[PDB]
Design a protein around this ligand. Structure first.
Ligand SMILES: NC(=O)C1=CN([C@@H]2O[C@H](COP(=O)(O)OP(=O)(O)OC[C@H]3O[C@@H](n4cnc5c(N)ncnc54)[C@H](OP(=O)(O)O)[C@@H]3O)[C@@H](O)[C@H]2O)C=CC1
Ligand SMILES: CCCCCCCCCCCC(=O)OC[C@H](COP(=O)(O)OCC[N+](C)(C)C)OC(=O)CCCCCCCCCCC
Ligand SMILES: CCCCCCCCCCCC(=O)OC[C@H](COP(=O)(O)OCC[N+](C)(C)C)OC(=O)CCCCCCCCCCC
Ligand SMILES: CCCCCCCCCCCC(=O)OC[C@H](COP(=O)(O)OCC[N+](C)(C)C)OC(=O)CCCCCCCCCCC
Ligand code: SF4
Ligand code: SF4
Ligand code: SF4
Ligand SMILES: [Zn+2]
Lengths: 69, 111, 139, 124, 175, 88, 115, 359
């Protein structure tokens, strides 16, 4: 369930020191992050036959006209 | 970019798999028997103004001869400079070889 | 990350000369550990500040003063500046490097707007060969 | 000298020069294919009038960097296996029968092989 | 009549400054070109998928505005025209009307494959095969679509050309 | 067959008169293609050796099903044509 | 939904005589707008010239015979009227519309390349 | 133009080169020539260059203005239009534009001397260097453009230098060179018409009493095109002019009447009677104070001299082309500057011309 979540549970840049308490007094919603990703975790290490055949058994094409109906 | 073996011989053996897959028909290959007899190509042109940077270049090669470098800053004043003949492709292949080593050796497991 | 506290620290460490170079092209006085230079001459730095944002932890300082061209960056380092690898090109183990049988001369940037610009041409001879004039007289 | 520059040859009678901008490649003068257009002819075009020939792309010729490489040898066997000599980023594996008595190149790399006995005969 | 033209006098782009006037009219050219180099106001001529990248340059990650780039909708207020996307035949007459209304000086940037030489739709019955058949182009950005940095690189190269303008020295020396 | 449908297809005037279409059979169906132009079908571009062309019907082939169906089409469009009988 | 100016329903006319009268009114409609086509598109040719070209257009294809192909020719000519009167075609297309256009002996065609 | 300009697919030049044209004459076709059009960035060049490129002839256009050569590349295909930076004082740059050229066209010609060139230095000094340098490179054909009133002994600087330009070429390029004399051409942004449309034309009575034989610039543009592909037209002199004779003052009121320009002509400055010394003095003063090419002292004399047809030369019909009259094209070229538009057709120009002559 997506209820409200604190700032320190979101992988984002936070506030260190008394500025955290300054932020929690001025900001309207204290549990929103600045949105800048965590440089220390986010992208830290860079990226550096018949038994199994069905196409030949596709459903056939049969048309029903007034004669066969 | 056109790659090259460490021994120096060209990786490309002129399938024309290149000319067939290319959705925009930007690959032009003409080949014949070399003097040593080993099958190589004397014409290999890419119309970078016609290419869509699809990536079927790199996927089609059975010898990894044609690959797409991580470069994007090669804008040119005259459009004629955007028609890459074989020598221009081979120049990039040498010029970007170490970088292509980063790309392939970091994408080897997933292919 | 943008306040004057970071700028003043980076101003004092770098000295006036390097910073004024950053105040001419970079527009942001930054400092970092030098990680080496390429063949062309660009100096590749990495920042150890805990305040820089995610994508700004690796930068360069070009050789030129007034004009900077991105293509001057050597291809080996060009992948490092793009955050695709944690191993700088001068720290590669020899089992991974590129070994070529041909000389590797100095890096050359993109050569547009200059007479050194690349010119395409057709590498194939014309497919029809004309006949050489030859005459032998009536016997 | 207007003769070998526009003719295809196995090798070059003269010793090539890296600083000659009329050669097909820095390491070879004559072109290595009958249909390949000689570089001296191509540069004699309208668009090379003011363009500098020094900066044009002149990659080293392939047909030389291979022949510098010494021929590989096989001891006490007549089947040569070559798969690019680079691991799994090479050409498809091919087996080379060594029954014929000369240097038989690989399908893709161009590497040449031999046997133990014919090592003295082939080198002649 | 009497005439004697020398032969070793070089071309304008190679001619060094000799007297004090050659420094005066170089100052006017740099000062005037620096104004156009910085106040680089293209025109929002996004046509196709290439237009997404042209927006991402204005995005906060790249922020074209930091370089003095402010897109202007009207041709009169725009000194550049970034032709991004396919130029169909149904558009080509309209494109010429938009280009011809730009007051001089004017530059055109061709971004992407479609604007350069036809691109994917080169063999289409209703696609102009390269916008260079309609408007002169000063720089071609290759890609599909060119990355947001590739366009910035293309912008920078054109800027490096504008800083090389020598109009007011041309009057003094070549006219 | 009697209908002058060429005034509704929008094809250029040259298709009615100056072009010839072959109705052949490559092994169960028939095809239609236009014979090549006298000159200007393929000239070597002097820049990059591209196979230039002015014929706009070179890349066109129509896959039919039955012979009389193809002949019906050719008469419907007012196309000059000839039929190549395959060897048995 | 509201259809645009100078629109007509697409109807498969099943009379030979009615189609004759529909065309005749249509030809007058082009001539009535002769002055406008000059002023709208800024054509270099005067009003009498356009009527002359319009007449050359209408005289050209008056001998068609197939009624099923009569409606098609009347349908598309209606679109040409609707596109032109609503000022939809660009200026260049109309200028080139009237700017289009004797052969040569076999020696003349043999030498240069014929076709 | 039509569909293909060349008379025959294979043409042999005077130098032995065997050129084979390919294609059906489109943008992607070729003709195997290489026509260096000197002064191509000018008014006349942009027509000469345009026709040559669209039919597949490589054009090498030496320029001195960098921002004016950009628009010439639209006409040709990739590689068809080439550029060489040059100045007439740089001999080496001249030889860059003639090395691969089979056709060399000369269009350089000025009416106002500047702080770097005199009238002789351009109509002769440029022409002499261009012609002589072209010969040394084995150029098969040279085509030249001079004044319509070339005269070695004329007191007008323009006519005197242009005439000597004919002699000095033929002593440098040789018998192969050709000379073409165009009458004042009228086209979009034509210098011949731009003086008539200007509202503040001081000395309008004096300047516009001169007589001319106006010729359509497109035909002269094709006139060089017809000559270019033919070797039969070497060593000739061609004067190209229009059948119906017109005078500037006849045109100026004819031009103004189409634009409908009561009190306004008397006030805005249409008719500025000024003393002859003042006109001579004003032109001299601006010659040291102006920065853009203004009305010159030479055009004060030329206004007293009427156009002269030379009978030793050859007309349009010598090339198989019938010249077109200013009546059929004068309206459209001033249509930019003009309830219900009145289109002054070909015949109705006379009826306008009638209204001007009636007092
Ligand atoms: N209807 C007409 O225009 C008339 C035609 N003529 C003559 O026909 C010839 C064609 O000229 P036209 O195009 O009509 O008018 P322009 O004066 O515009 O043509 C001038 C061309 O020659 C170049 N030029 C002039 N001086 C120099 C110089 N010192 N160095 C290099 N280039 C120079 C110009 O270069 P750039 O423009 O790039 O600076 C331009 O390309 C002229 O000689 C003209 O006098 C006769 C009477 C009137
Ligand atoms: C108030 C006005 C202040 C002008 C500030 C802009 C400077 C400028 O426009 O400077 C640019 C120009 C020209 O460039 P340059 O580097 O001198 O070119 C010469 C290059 N040499 C020296 C290597 C050959 O300099 C000047 O002409 C300097 C004098 C004007 C001050
Ligand atoms: C009163 C009017 C309003 C104000 C006028 C000023 C507006 C801004 C001017 C922009 C200038 C510009 O752009 O100069 C910067 C450009 C950019 O270098 P580049 O183009 O790559 O060439 C330079 C490299 N070269 C020449 C080797 C190719 O040149 C210069 O480095 C000029 C040289 C530096 C001049 C420093 C000394 C003069 C100081 C004058 C101030 C006191
Ligand atoms: C405002 C004042 C304009 C002065 C023009 C000028 O000084 O011009 C004077 C002369 C004339 O040369 P021009 O104007 O190029 O002649 C061509 C134009 N005509 C044909 C209309 C005459 O040139 C010089 O000696 C230039 C010296 C530079 C002075 C500093 C500016
Ligand atoms: S990357 Fe470009 S050239 Fe290569 S196959 Fe794809 S579209 Fe063709
Ligand atoms: S797939 Fe590889 S080897 Fe085959 S033609 Fe293309 S580049 Fe050459
Ligand atoms: S070049 Fe590619 S991205 Fe750009 S408009 Fe064309 S298809 Fe879209
Ligand atoms: Zn192998």
């Amino acid at each position: 369930s997506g209820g409200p979540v604190p700032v320190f549970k979101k992988y984002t840049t936070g506030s260190k020191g008394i500025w955290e308490k300054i932020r929690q007094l001025l900001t309207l919603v204290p549990n929103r992050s600045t949105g800048n990703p965590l440089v220390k975790n986010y992208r830290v290490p860079p990226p550096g036959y018949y038994d199994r055949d069905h196409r030949r058994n596709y459903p056939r094409l049969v048309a029903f006209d007034q004669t066969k109906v | 970019a056109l790659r090259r073996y460490p021994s120096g011989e060209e990786r490309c053996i002129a399938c024309k798999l290149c000319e067939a897959v290319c959705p925009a028909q930007a690959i032009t290959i003409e080949a014949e028997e070399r003097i040593d007899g080993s099958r190589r190509t004397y014409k290999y042109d890419i119309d970078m103004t016609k290419c869509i940077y699809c990536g079927y270049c790199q996927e089609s090669c059975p010898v990894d001869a044609i690959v797409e470098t991580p470069n994007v800053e090669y804008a040119t004043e005259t459009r004629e400079e955007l028609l890459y003949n074989k020598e221009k492709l081979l120049a990039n292949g040498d010029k970007w070889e170490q970088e292509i080593q980063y790309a392939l050796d970091a994408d080897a497991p997933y292919r | 990350s943008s306040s004057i506290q970071r700028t003043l620290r980076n101003l004092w460490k770098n000295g006036f000369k390097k910073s004024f170079k950053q105040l001419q092209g970079y527009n942001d006085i930054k400092s970092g550990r030098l990680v080496g230079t390429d063949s062309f001459g660009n100096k590749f730095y990495e920042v150890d500040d805990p305040v820089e944002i995610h994508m700004r932890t690796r930068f360069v300082e070009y050789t030129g003063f007034w004009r900077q061209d991105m293509s001057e960056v050597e291809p080996g380092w060009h992948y490092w500046l793009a955050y695709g690898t944690d191993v700088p090109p001068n720290q590669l183990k020899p089992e991974e490097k590129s070994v070529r049988a041909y000389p590797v001369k100095k890096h050359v940037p993109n050569l547009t707007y200059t007479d050194g610009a690349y010119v395409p041409y057709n590498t194939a001879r014309p497919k029809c060969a004309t006949w050489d004039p030859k005459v032998t007289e009536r016997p | 000298s207007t003769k070998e520059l526009t003719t295809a040859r196995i090798k070059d009678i003269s010793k090539p020069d890296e600083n000659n901008l009329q050669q097909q490649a820095p390491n070879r003068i004559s072109p290595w294919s009958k249909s390949q257009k000689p570089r001296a002819e191509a540069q004699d075009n309208v668009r090379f009038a003011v363009k500098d020939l020094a900066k044009q792309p002149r990659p080293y010729a392939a047909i030389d960097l291979i022949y510098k490489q010494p021929i590989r040898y096989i001891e006490h066997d007549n089947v040569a296996v070559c798969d690019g000599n680079g691991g799994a980023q090479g050409h498809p594996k091919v087996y080379i029968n060594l029954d014929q008595n000369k240097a038989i190149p690989c399908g893709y790399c161009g590497l040449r092989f031999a046997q133990a006995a014919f090592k003295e005969d082939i080198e002649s | 009549y009497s005439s004697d033209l020398p032969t070793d006098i070089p071309v304008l782009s190679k001619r060094p400054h000799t007297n004090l006037l050659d420094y005066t009219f170089t100052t006017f050219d740099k000062m005037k070109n620096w104004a156009r180099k910085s106040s680089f106001w293209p025109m929002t001529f996004g046509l196709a998928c290439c237009a997404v990248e042209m927006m991402h340059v204005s995005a906060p990650r790249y922020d074209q505005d930091r370089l003095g780039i402010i897109f202007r909708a009207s041709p009169r207020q725009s000194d550049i025209m970034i032709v991004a996307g396919t130029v169909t035949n149904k558009m080509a007459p309209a494109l010429r009307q938009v280009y011809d209304q730009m007051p001089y000086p004017r530059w055109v940037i061709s971004m992407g494959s479609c604007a350069n030489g036809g691109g994917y739709y080169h063999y289409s019955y209703s696609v102009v095969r390269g916008v260079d058949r309609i408007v002169p182009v000063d720089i071609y950005v290759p890609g599909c679509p060119p990355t947001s940095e590739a366009l910035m690189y293309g912008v920078f190269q054109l800027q490096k050309k504008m800083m090389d303008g020598q109009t007011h020295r041309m009057w003094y020396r070549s006219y | 067959t009697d209908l002058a449908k060429e005034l509704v297809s929008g094809a250029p005037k040259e298709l009615i008169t100056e072009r010839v279409a072959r109705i052949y059979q490559e092994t169960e169906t028939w095809k239609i293609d236009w014979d090549i132009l006298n000159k200007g079908n393929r000239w070597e571009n002097d820049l990059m050796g591209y196979q230039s062309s002015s014929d706009y019907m070179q890349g066109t082939i129509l896959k039919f099903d039955t012979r009389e169906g193809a002949i019906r089409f050719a008469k419907g469009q007012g196309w000059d044509y000839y039929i190549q009988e395959p060897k048995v | 939904t509201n259809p645009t100016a100078f629109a007509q329903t697409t109807r498969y006319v099943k009379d030979s005589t009615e189609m004759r009268t529909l065309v005749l009114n249509l030809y007058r409609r082009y001539l009535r707008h002769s002055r406008g086509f000059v002023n709208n598109y800024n054509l270099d040719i005067p009003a009498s010239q356009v009527r002359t070209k319009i007449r050359q257009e209408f005289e050209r294809q008056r001998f068609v015979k197939d009624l099923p192909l009569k409606n098609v020719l009347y349908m598309k000519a209606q679109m040409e009227f609707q596109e032109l009167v609503n000022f939809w075609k660009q200026q260049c297309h109309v200028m080139q519309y009237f700017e289009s256009i004797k052969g040569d002996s076999f020696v003349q065609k043999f030498l240069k390349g014929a076709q | 133009v039509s569909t293909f300009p060349l008379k025959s697919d294979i043409n042999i030049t005077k130098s032995g080169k065997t050129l084979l044209s390919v294609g059906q004459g489109g943008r992607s076709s070729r003709t195997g020539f290489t026509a260096t059009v000197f002064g191509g960035t000018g008014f006349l060049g942009r027509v000469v260059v345009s026709k040559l490129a669209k039919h597949g002839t490589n054009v090498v256009v030496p320029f001195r203005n960098d921002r004016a050569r950009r628009q010439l590349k639209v006409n040709g295909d990739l590689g068809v239009v080439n550029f060489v930076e040059f100045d007439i004082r740089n001999l080496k740059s001249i030889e860059d534009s003639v090395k691969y050229s089979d056709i060399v066209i000369n269009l350089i010609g000025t009416e106002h001397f500047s702080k770097n060139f005199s009238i002789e230095d351009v109509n002769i000094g440029a022409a002499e260097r261009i012609a002589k340098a072209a010969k040394e490179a084995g150029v098969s054909r040279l085509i030249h453009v001079s004044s319509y009133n070339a005269n070695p002994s004329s007191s007008s600087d323009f006519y005197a230098t242009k005439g000597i330009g004919e002699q000095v070429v033929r002593d440098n390029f040789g018998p192969d060179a050709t000379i073409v004399r165009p009458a004042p051409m009228y086209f979009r942004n034509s210098p011949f018409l731009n003086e008539l449309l200007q509202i503040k034309a001081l000395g309008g009575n004096v300047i516009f009493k001169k007589e001319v034989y106006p010729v359509h610039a497109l035909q002269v543009g094709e006139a060089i095109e017809r000559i270019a592909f033919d070797d039969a037209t070497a060593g000739q002199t061609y004067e190209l002019f229009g059948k119906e004779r017109y005078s500037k003052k006849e045109l100026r009121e004819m031009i103004k009447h189409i634009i409908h320009i009561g009190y306004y002509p008397y006030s805005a400055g249409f008719y500025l009677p000024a003393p002859e010394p003042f006109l001579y003095a004003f032109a001299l003063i601006r010659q040291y104070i102006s920065s853009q090419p203004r009305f010159n002292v030479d055009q004060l004399k030329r206004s007293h001299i009427n156009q002269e047809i030379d009978q030793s030369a050859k007309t349009f019909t010598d090339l198989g082309m019938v010249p077109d009259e200013l009546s059929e094209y004068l309206y459209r070229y001033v249509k930019p500057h003009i309830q219900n538009r009145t289109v002054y057709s070909k015949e109705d120009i006379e009826k306008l011309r009638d209204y001007v002559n009636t007092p």
